Amino acid sequence: RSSRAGLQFPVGRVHRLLRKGNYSERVGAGAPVYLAAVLEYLTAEILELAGNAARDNKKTRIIPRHLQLAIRNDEELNKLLGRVTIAQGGVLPNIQAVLLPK
Amino acid sequence: TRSSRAGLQFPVGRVHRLLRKGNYSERVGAGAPVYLAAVLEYLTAEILELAGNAARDNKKTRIIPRHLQLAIRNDEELNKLLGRVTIAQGGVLPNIQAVLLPK
Amino acid sequence: DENDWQMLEMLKPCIEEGFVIQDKEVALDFIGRRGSAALGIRREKRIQY
Amino acid sequence: RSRKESYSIYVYKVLKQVHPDTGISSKAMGIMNSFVNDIFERIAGEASRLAHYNKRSTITSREIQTAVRLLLPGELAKHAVSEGTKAVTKYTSAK
Amino acid sequence: SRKESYSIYVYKVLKQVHPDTGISSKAMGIMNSFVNDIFERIAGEASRLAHYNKRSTITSREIQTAVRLLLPGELAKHAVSEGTKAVTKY
Amino acid sequence: NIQGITKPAIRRLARRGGVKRISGLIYEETRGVLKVFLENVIRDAVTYTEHAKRKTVTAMDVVYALKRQGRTLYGFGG
Amino acid sequence: RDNIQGITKPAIRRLARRGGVKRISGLIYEETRGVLKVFLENVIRDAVTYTEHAKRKTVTAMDVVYALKRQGRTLYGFGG
Amino acid sequence: HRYRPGTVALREIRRYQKSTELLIRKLPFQRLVREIAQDFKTDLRFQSAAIGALQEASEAYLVGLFEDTNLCAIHAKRVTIMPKDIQLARRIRGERA
Amino acid sequence: PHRYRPGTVALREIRRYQKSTELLIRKLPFQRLVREIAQDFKTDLRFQSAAIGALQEASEAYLVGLFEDTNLCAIHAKRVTIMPKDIQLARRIRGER
C-alpha cells in the first residue's frame, strides 16, 4: 500500500500501531494513508530547513544544533513546538538592544 | 447495588460502563472503579467542605458559585489543581496591592 | 491522423479518466481488484496474478 | 428526547452528609458535574499512559492508585490513598 | 531486540530532499521522537472527536479536521492538499 | 464593529484585574490581544462545528476548543 | 551533603551568559539554587513514582521522559 | 465637592472585586463575535450558550492578563500601566513566538 | 596581555557560549545533587546515566528560560543589574511555583 500510495512512511506499520492504539473500535482503510501523507509532509518541511542550516555552516552531517536553529528560524514551527525542548540544542544567537556598548 | 457494598454515594456500574465506552484500555479490573469512586468522593467532600465554610462567610444557606471560587482559590493545593481552570461566574479574590494604598 | 481532432476529442475523456493511475503496478492492482484475485492475496501476489 | 445524565443526586447526598444545614444552587451542581468529569478524564488518561508504558492492559486498582498520587498534590493525595485503600478493603473483605 | 524505529524511512525522505546530506544517530532519535509525538497528538485528537460526535470508528475525515485543529493556517492548508492528493491517488 | 468595547468597560476590567491608573494606548493594545485570542478560539470552534456537519455553533464545541487551548472552563457541562 | 553548593558560582554565571544575562548580582545565586531544587523535587517525585509502579529497583531514562511528558516540558532525543 | 485621586479608583476596585456578573454587556460583544466569525463561513447561526461561554472566557482572560500587567508595572517602579507591560507579560506567557 | 573596561569579557562570553553547544553545569556534582534529593523519597536507588543527563538537559532548559524572562524583566525595568525580585516577577507570571 506504500506503493499504492506512492509514499514512503509505511502505511501498514501505521495501521498496526493504530489497531493497538485504543482510539476507536474500527479503523478505516484510507485514514492511515492520509496520516502518513501528513507526517511525510512535516518531515520534509523540517528536513528542508535542516538542509539550509547545514548549508549555512557548510557542514555535511546534520547535527542537532542545525535542527534547533532550523526550528527556531521558522515562525509557524516555533508556534507549534514552543513547549518542546530538543536535547543538545542551545538557543538562537540572540543579543538584546541595550546590551551592546554604545 | 455494589455502591453500598463499599458504602459510598457514587456508583460503580456507571463508572465501569464509562471505562469501557471511553476505550481507556481493553479490560477493566474488578475493584478499580470502587477505588475511583472513593477518590472522587473524598475530593468533592473537601471541596464542598470549604464551600460550606464559604457559605458561612457571607451568611447564606444555599451555595452560590462565588463561594465555590473563593473556596477553591483560598486553599493552596486546591489553587494548585484548579488554577488552570477558570470557573463561570467565578470572579477573583478580594485583592488589594498594599503598595497602591494611599498614605 | 494527427489533424483528426475528433479522434482526440473523444479520446481525452478516456485519457483524463484513466489519468488517476500513472504507473504500472497500481494498474495491475486495479485489475486484480476485479480480476478473480481472491482477497488477501498480497499486493505483489495480486500483481503476479 | 435523549435521556441525558448528570451527578446531581449523588453529590447532593454527599452535601447532605457533611453539611446538612446547607443548600445548593443547580448552577453549582452543573459546575461540580463538570469538575468531576474533568477529574475523571485526567485520571483516565493517566491510567491509559500507565497501561501503555507498562506493556499491559489489565487495569488493577494499583494503576489507579499511582495515577491518584501523580495527578493530585501531595497530602491531599495521601488522604486519597487512605480513602481508596479503605474502600477496597471494605468492599473486598465483604461482598 | 526488534525495537522498531523510523530510521530508514526518514533516510529515504532525506535522500529524496537533500540527496547528498548525511545525518547523525541522535538527530535520527530526535526525528523519531518528533514523529511519535505528532502521531500521538493527532490520534488522541481524533479519538476525542470520535467521542465528541459518538462515532465509534475512524475514517480519513477525522484526521483531516484533526490536522485542521493542530497546525495553524498555511502548513495546515498544505497538509490538507497533500493528504487529499495521496488519498485520491490511492 | 470593534468599538462596542467601550473605554469605561475596559476601565472596569482594569479595576477587577487590580490596576489603579490607566494610560491611553492600553485600549488599542487590549483590542488587539482580544481580537487575536477570539480568532484562535472561533477558528477551533468552527473547525469542530464543520466536523459536526451542522450550521450552528454549540456550547460543546466552545468547551472542547478551550480544552484544546489548555484553558479548560467549567460550568457548562463539558 | 551540601551538594546544592555543588552548583558553583561560575556555573550559574555560565548559564547566565548562555541565556544572555550581562550583569549578575550576588543575591541571585542561592535563589537560583532554590528554584533548581524545587524543579528537581517535582521531577524526581514523578520519576520515583514511575519507578515504583514499574516494580523495579532501577530508574530508567524512559521514565524520566514520560514524567516530563506529564509536565508539559517534553524532551525529545533520548527515546520515547 | 471633589475627592482626591485614588479614592474613587480603589473604592471601585473594592466595589468590583465582589460581583461576578459580566461587564462587557451582551449585544455589542455579540455583534463583535459575529463579525469575527463571519470570515470563516457565511451565515452561521448561534446558540446563546456559546456566546455566554466566550463572554465569560474573555473577561476572565483579561482579568488574568491585567494581573500580570499590573505586577510588571509595579515591579519596574511605576504606578500606572503602559502597553509595553502587556507586551512584556505576553512575551513571558509564550503567546508571541 | 592587558585589561580593558568591564563589558568586553561579557559580550565575549555571550558569543562564545551561544556558539557553544554542550553542558554548562558539570556532571558529578549534579549527579550527587540528584542522589541527595532522590534518597529522601526512597532508599537505595540505581540509575541510568542517560536519565541523569536528561535531568541535566531539562534543568539547563528551565534555567535558560527563567534567565531569558528575567533579562526581559530587567531590560524592561531600565536596569541591567538583575535582582531577585525580577525572578519573583518571572515565576509569578509563569504561575509555576
Residues in G touching A95 (Cβ below 8 Å): 20
- Nearest Cα of chain G lies from the Cα of E38 at a distance, in angstroms, of 12
Q: How many CA atoms lie within 13 A of D32 on its CB side?
A: 29
Fill in the amino acid letter for F35.
Answer: K
- Return the ∠ at Cα I60 (arms to I55 and I61), rounded to 5°: 95
- Tell whether B1 lies on the interface with F, counting CB pairs under 8 A: no
The pair phi, psi for residue E65, each rounded to 5°, is -70, -20
Structural domain boundaries in chain F: 1-78
Closest alpha carbon to A30 in E89, C42, E83, E59: E59
Residues in E touching G74 (Cβ below 8 Å): 37
Record: contact G31-I87, CB cut-off 8 A:
yes
The whole-angstrom separation of Cα E29 and Cα C35 is 44
Method of determination is: cryo-EM
Q: Which chains touch D (3 or more CB pairs under 8 A)?
A: B, F, G
- Residue of B10, B17, B40, B81 to mutate, testing the D interface (most D Cβ within 10 Å of its Cβ): B40
The pair phi, psi for residue G75, each rounded to 5°, is -105, 125
The whole-angstrom separation of Cα E11 and Cα E23 is 9
What CATH number does residue I63 fall under? 1.10.20.10
The whole-angstrom separation of Cα I7 and Cα H74 is 29
By DSSP bridging, strand H45-46 and strand G74-75 are unpaired
Task: Specify whether domain E1-90 bears CATH 1.20.120.1200.
Answer: no
Residue A84, beta-bridge partner list: G74
- Return the ∠ at Cα H74 (arms to H71 and H77), rounded to 5°: 150
Q: Read out DSSP for B6-55?
A: TT-SS-SHHHHHHHHHTT-SSEE-SSHHHHHHHHHHHHHHHHHHHHHHHH
Q: Where are the alpha helices (DSSP H) in D1-95?
A: 8-18, 26-52, 61-71, 74-93
Q: Name the residue with cell 493504530.
A: A18
Residue B63, beta-bridge partner list: D24
By DSSP bridging, strand E57-58 and strand F56-57 are unpaired
Record: contact H84-I78, CB cut-off 8 A:
no
Residues in B touching D76 (Cβ below 8 Å): 43, 46, 77
According to CATH, the topology of domain B1-103 is Histone, subunit A (1.10.20)
Fill in the amino acid letter for D75.
Answer: E
- Tell whether D45 lies on the interface with F, counting CB pairs under 8 A: no
Residue E11 in grid coordinates: 533516510
The whole-angstrom separation of Cα G73 and Cα A81 is 10
- Based on its alpha-carbon atoms, the radius of gyration of chain E, rounded to whole angstroms, reads 16
- Residue of A59, A67, A85, A94 to mutate, testing the I interface (most I Cβ within 10 Å of its Cβ): A85
The whole-angstrom separation of Cα D47 and Cα B35 is 13
Q: Is G65 helix (H, G, I), strand (E, B) or coil?
A: helix
- Tell whether D69 lies on the interface with G, counting CB pairs under 8 A: yes
Contacts of B73 (CB under 8 A, 6+ apart): B79, B92, B93
Residue G31 in grid coordinates: 535563589
Fill in the amino acid letter for G10.
Answer: P
Closest alpha carbon to F76 in B91, B90, B37: B90
Counted across chains A and E, CB pairs separated by less than 8 A come out at: 148
Residue D59, beta-bridge partner list: B28
Fill in the amino acid letter for A66.
Answer: H
How far the first Cα of chain H sits from its last, in Å, is: 50
**How many residues are given for chain G?**
80
CA dihedral angle for residue C23, residue C27, residue C30, residue C36, rounded to 10 degrees: -150
Task: Tell me if there are at least 3 CB pairs under 8 Å linking chains G and B.
Answer: no
Structural domain boundaries in chain D: 1-95
Residue H45, beta-bridge partner list: F56
- Nearest Cα of chain H lies from the Cα of F25 at a distance, in angstroms, of 6
How far the first Cα of chain F sits from its last, in Å, is: 31
- Tell whether A96 lies on the interface with G, counting CB pairs under 8 A: yes
CATH architecture group of domain A1-102 = Orthogonal Bundle (1.10)
Fill in the amino acid letter for A98.
Answer: V
**Chain A residue at shortest CA distance from H96:** A79
Tell which E residues from 4 to 33 touch C, by Cβ distance under 8 Å: none
Q: Name the residue with cell 479536521.
A: E65
CATH architecture group of domain G1-80 = Orthogonal Bundle (1.10)
Other Cβ atoms closer than 10 A to E26? 17
Residue G76 in grid coordinates: 525529545
Other Cβ atoms closer than 10 A to G49? 19
- Return the ∠ at Cα G53 (arms to G50 and G57), rounded to 5°: 85
Task: Specify whether domain F1-78 bears CATH 1.25.50.10.
Answer: no
The whole-angstrom separation of Cα G51 and Cα G44 is 10
Counted across chains H and I, CB pairs separated by less than 8 A come out at: 34
Structural domain boundaries in chain B: 1-103
According to CATH, the topology of domain D1-95 is Histone, subunit A (1.10.20)
Long-range contacts (CB closer than 8 Å, 24 or more residues apart) made by E19-23: E21/A51, E21/A54, E21/A60, E21/A61, E21/A62, E22/A60, E22/A61, E22/A62, E23/A61, E23/A62
- Tell whether C41 lies on the interface with A, counting CB pairs under 8 A: no
Q: Please return the burial class of B65, using the count of CB atoms within 10 Å of its CB with bins 0-12, 13-18 and 19+.
A: buried
**How many residues are given for chain B?**
103
The whole-angstrom separation of Cα A33 and Cα A15 is 9
The whole-angstrom separation of Cα F33 and Cα H78 is 23
Q: Read out DSSP for chain A?
A: -HHHHT-SS-HHHHHHHHHTT-S-SEE-SSHHHHHHHHHHHHHHHHHHHHHHHHHHTT-SSBPHHHHHHHHHH-SHHHHHSTTEE-TT--------STTS--
Q: Is F73 helix (H, G, I), strand (E, B) or coil?
A: strand
DSSP state of H23: S
Q: Name the residue with cell 516540558.
A: G73
- In angstroms, what CA-CA distances link F1 with F6, F32, F35, H30, H36? 11, 13, 12, 10, 10
The whole-angstrom separation of Cα D57 and Cα B39 is 22
- Based on its alpha-carbon atoms, the radius of gyration of chain I, rounded to whole angstroms, reads 18
The whole-angstrom separation of Cα A27 and Cα A20 is 11
CA dihedral angle for residue F60, residue F66, residue F72, residue F73, rounded to 10 degrees: -50
Closest alpha carbon to A46 in E75, F69, G61, F64: E75
Q: Is G61 helix (H, G, I), strand (E, B) or coil?
A: helix
Closest alpha carbon to I65 in G18, B84, A63: G18
Q: Read out DSSP for I41-68?
A: TSSS--B-HHHHHHHHHHHHHHHHHHHH
Q: Read out DSSP for chain I?
A: -----TTHHHHHHHHHHHH--S-SS-HHHHHHHHHHHHHTTSSS--B-HHHHHHHHHHHHHHHHHHHHHHHHHHHHTT-SB--HHHHHHHHHHT---
Residue E58 in grid coordinates: 475512524
Q: Contact G63/I51 with Cβ under 8 angstroms? A: yes
- In angstroms, what CA-CA distances link H92 with E44, G31, G68, I76, I92? 29, 19, 21, 12, 10
Fill in the amino acid letter for B44.
Answer: T
Number of domain units in chain I:
1
- Tell whether E39 lies on the interface with G, counting CB pairs under 8 A: no
**The domain containing residue I78 runs over which residues?**
2-97
